Amino acid sequence: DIQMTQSPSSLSASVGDRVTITCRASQGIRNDLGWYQQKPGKAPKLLIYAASSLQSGVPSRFSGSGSGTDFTLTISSLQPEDFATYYCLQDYNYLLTFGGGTKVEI
Amino acid sequence: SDRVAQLTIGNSTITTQEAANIIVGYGEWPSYCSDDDATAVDKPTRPDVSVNRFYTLDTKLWEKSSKGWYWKFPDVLTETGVFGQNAQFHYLYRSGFCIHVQCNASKFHQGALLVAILPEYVIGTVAGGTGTEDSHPPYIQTQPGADGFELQHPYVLDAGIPISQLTVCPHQWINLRTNNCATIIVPYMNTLPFDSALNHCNFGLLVVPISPLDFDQGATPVIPITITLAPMCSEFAGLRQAVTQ
Amino acid sequence: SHENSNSATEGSTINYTTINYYKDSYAATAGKQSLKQDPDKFANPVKDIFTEMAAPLK
Amino acid sequence: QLQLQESGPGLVKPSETLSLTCTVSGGSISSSSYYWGWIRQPPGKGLEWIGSIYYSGSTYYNPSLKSRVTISVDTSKNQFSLKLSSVTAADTAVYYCAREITMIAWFDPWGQGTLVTVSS
Amino acid sequence: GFPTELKPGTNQFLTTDDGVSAPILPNFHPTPCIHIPGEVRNLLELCQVETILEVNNVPTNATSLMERLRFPVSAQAGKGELCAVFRADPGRDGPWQSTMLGQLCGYYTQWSGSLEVTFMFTGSFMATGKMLIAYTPPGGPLPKDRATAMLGTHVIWDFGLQSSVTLVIPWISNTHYRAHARDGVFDYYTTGLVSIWYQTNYVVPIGAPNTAYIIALAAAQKNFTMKLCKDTSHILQTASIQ
Amino acid sequence: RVADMIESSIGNSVSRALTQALPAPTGQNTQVSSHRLDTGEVPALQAAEIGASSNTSDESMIETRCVLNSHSTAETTLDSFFSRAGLVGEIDLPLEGTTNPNGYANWDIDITGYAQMRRKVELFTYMRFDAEFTFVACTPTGQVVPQLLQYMFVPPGAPKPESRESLAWQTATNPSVFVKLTDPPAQVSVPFMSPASAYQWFYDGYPTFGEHKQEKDLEYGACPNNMMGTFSVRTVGSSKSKYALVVRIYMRMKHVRAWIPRPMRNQNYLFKANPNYAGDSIKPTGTSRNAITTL
Ligand SMILES: CCCCCCCCCCCCC/C=C/[C@H](O)[C@H](N)CO
């Protein structure tokens, strides 16, 4: 199984700052990556699919970039409501694997 | 009618079915030097059937992480056939070219491949990376013969200039979904009527995958790229003994 | 006009309009270069031309 | 709009047959452009997709769990169920059932989530 | 001799002055000019040649620089998803800096005429799909969704045997020429925004890659012109040449 | 009778031009266009693989009004883009130091010493032009002093001066210019002096035959047709000048003819007459944004 490595495993930022979290696979999926947010004790929420498509209802401050090996999720202005754990999910060869998960807290 | 083509020259013929149009670099066909342009007085040599023909140099493998390759013209032919012999025996050479790059794949393969002619393609080294070394490229890198050379920094074309603007020179694309070959006719481009085929490289052929090759496991993994080329209106003058460099 | 034609644009299938005060032509002014244009030499250097309306590949 | 709300026993001691049942409300399970996946999350750890079921019965299992799981779909009652055989201590977790679009890394909407602990 | 009066501006050295100078070599004739292919008479001939537009100017690592020459198109959820967006003003920092048109605009202050961006689909032959490529004139913000973008100028591209489409960005300006747009008051000269959306999904059969790439190539139309030549703020070397 | 020797019987030497230049004094006008609901004729679809640029126009993509465009194309000609004097040389004649300390200097002629003019001229492979050179002499502070300078153009093969007393400064045949620093700048016009039909900023080859070893790699790219001699400057006197001097040399082209446009330099220049670049500091052509979907 191709395993995705995320960076960093934790963060600490302020409101109104840009938070960048990277997730890079060993091999190339080239768009088969999505980004999910999860508040403590709640189900994951689909932020991004195809590594670039903003899910309807997700604020435009969330942005997915890149393709192939490395992918990037950026929050242009971190918000108090954006304290959560973010995962990257790859779906290659019809087998889906989640990332390590980064706990973004203010 | 416009996708099927046949290029016949000398004793050679190339047939293609999934092809684009033919590009005549700068809108001019190769021709012989006129009496007003010429300066050398000895009568030129025009073999015209034994040198003006298609030669197949060698084949590269297009992998999913290829940087791209380049060849130097007329350096690729300085050791192949009667043209190579003429270019070694004569001091002065002149000719245009018809380059034909071939790359075929299934309808389930994808990838794009820019094929460009860059006149006076000077190669620049990395200057030791930090930009302090007054380094110069070795002889093998400037004139790689018929094997070409694998590009190290395709984005700057190994010369500090952007590949994105390389489409300003005579070029075509090999788009595996549309065509499987590219044909470019280049006239003789030089500030002189003749010149040496051993010291001066008139232009460089570049083959750079702009869109990476892709396919699913189970399809053919080996996608070759074959370069073929025909000298045209070849002229040689200044007969002497043979020299290779 | 008994000044020798020494300019770097003598011939050139062009017609300049230069001012000169010497017998050497290359010492003249720049003049007005001809406003001709051959864009297809680079934009459309195809052996077989095709119209805008037609499908390029057939 | 679509909603998922699964049910299943909260206590499953080892070597039992852990079984869930996810029902779909406000929509049809018989849709040709959606799979139905099961996601497992150990307490305090990350997520781990288990397997997806197609309304025609086709399955895609996790290679780590291709033999110890069974995902079934009942189109009559708009439901799908997961059943785990030979449960161990490394099986307790919170489980979710999600709607999936293949080849896009899509999982939306999700369920409320059901947490099961392996204990006697 | 002949009475004369010297006026203001004598002894000055204007670099753009076009006058006669003293020749250093009397009776000198240059080497005759032979015919050379590819002569250029006007710079506009270069502006009407398509060059790759770096719409995907996200990556900057020295190894991922070539990924700027194309942007991805993938299977989506069939909800009119947004694919890419860029500004349409060629003299501005951004994608257009990758084109010969952009570099030449760097040397001129004011420009005019219609632009043209050709997108080439470099995916599999079995891959089908439809896109909506929309130009939004100035004033209108970046469209939030396909419905808002559809209200401006736009074309609907269908992937097929012809693997390229042309979006003609027409000259829609209040002024006859445009100075290069920039952040600040000079944003008054903005051209608008080019967006790309999914008209339908990107559809492939089994065994074809789920992701393809589009290569954008920009150029100028025939009503294009530039004026007020200047020095480029495009490269700005930061050292001396040894 | 041989048929094939008669069939050709002629070297055409025509260079059949697929295209010709037409007069384009102004950008083309726009014609009125209306809606077209048709089949078979689709001007919007192209084939970028053919290698040609799109022939699509405004009239076929939108419904356009008639615009009578009277915008001149005169300023984008070569004689408008290159006939601008820019700094190409800077020579120093100080009183103390290790550079040109003996009141004279030699400067081999080359446009590739400064980034601006170099990048402007690199746009083309070949150029043929007549130069106009202007010399602006002053002190490092820009002060104008009463000093007499001699500028001598020494073509290749002529004796270069080794001292300000050198007999080479007699200029029996070499062009020379005597200027007081209080006079206006010294301006001369130079013809096209290359042995070839045009200067070439890119010469993919070696000037000499033989084996090409690493110790001679610096000969790669050296075009003797571009080496037009040296410019030697001295303070006219048998005694050291009492003023520290700097001479800035500007050049504007005229009667310009260019061939083979090239991709424009997008990396910092490192050395003269080679495309060398820093491999560890390669940079994108333009600015970079955060995401392709956001501005
Ligand atoms: C009395 C002083 C006269 C000054 C003489 C200056 C002569 C200048 C030589 C002609 C102009 C050369 C233009 C550039 C040619 C070559 O490409 C460069 N040297 C190489 O980069």
Residue numbers in the entry:
A (entry chain L): 1 to 106
B (entry chain B): 10 to 254
C (entry chain D): 12 to 69
D (entry chain H): 1 to 120
E (entry chain C): 1 to 242
F (entry chain A): 3 to 297
Give the authors' words.
EV71 is a picornavirus and its capsid contains 60 copies of each of four proteins VP1–VP4, arranged with pseudo T = 3 symmetry. In contrast to the canyon and fivefold vertex epitopes, the margin of the pentamer is not within or adjacent to known receptor binding sites, but we have shown that natural infection can induce neutralizing antibody responses to this part of the viral capsid (notably the so-called the plateau epitope, located close to the icosahedral threefold axes). The cryo-electron microscopy (cryo-EM) structures of the EV71 virion in complex with two representative plateau-binding neutralizing antibodies reveal that their binding footprints are conserved in the great majority of circulating EV71 strains and these antibodies are therapeutic for lethal challenge in a murine infection. In summary we have shown that humans naturally infected with EV71 make an antibody response that includes rare neutralizing and highly protective antibodies that bind close to the threefold axes of the virus capsid, and larger numbers of non-neutralizing antibodies, many of which do not bind the viral capsid.
